[PDB]
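does this look right to u?? chloride ion version
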Amino acid sequence: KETAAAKFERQHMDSSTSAASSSNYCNQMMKSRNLTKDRCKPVNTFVHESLADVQAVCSQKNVACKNGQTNCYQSYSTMSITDCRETGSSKYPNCAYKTTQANKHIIVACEGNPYVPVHFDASV
Ligand SMILES: [Cl-]
Ligand SMILES: [Cl-]
Ligand SMILES: [Cl-]
Ligand code: NA
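got this back:
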């Protein structure tokens, strides 16, 4: 049974590459992180920074989350990210994703002790 912090790591951290350099990155990563197991997760962002750098966002700019909560934090700097989105022709179990690489500020919700990211809210 997965902790919220561990779920964030599994869904959103990819420190092993500096960027998505292939159109098939999302198809491979959504599968290997078990985000296509019982259904195709429609949208998911991977962050290509160290875990420490992403955890540090919880001490950066405090902003509102989309849902009105006030435990969201926006990174001061831009980060390398890859947005993965199901294509219109995708449907389980043959999940298919579009890969879009970008450099953007990330916004995460943080909780707990230690105070760490538990939800990916958006990128700007
Ligand atoms: Cl898993
Ligand atoms: Cl996401
Ligand atoms: Cl402020
Ligand atoms: Na947790």
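Residues 10, 34 surround chloride ion (ligand 1) (CB under 6 Å). idk if thats expected tbh
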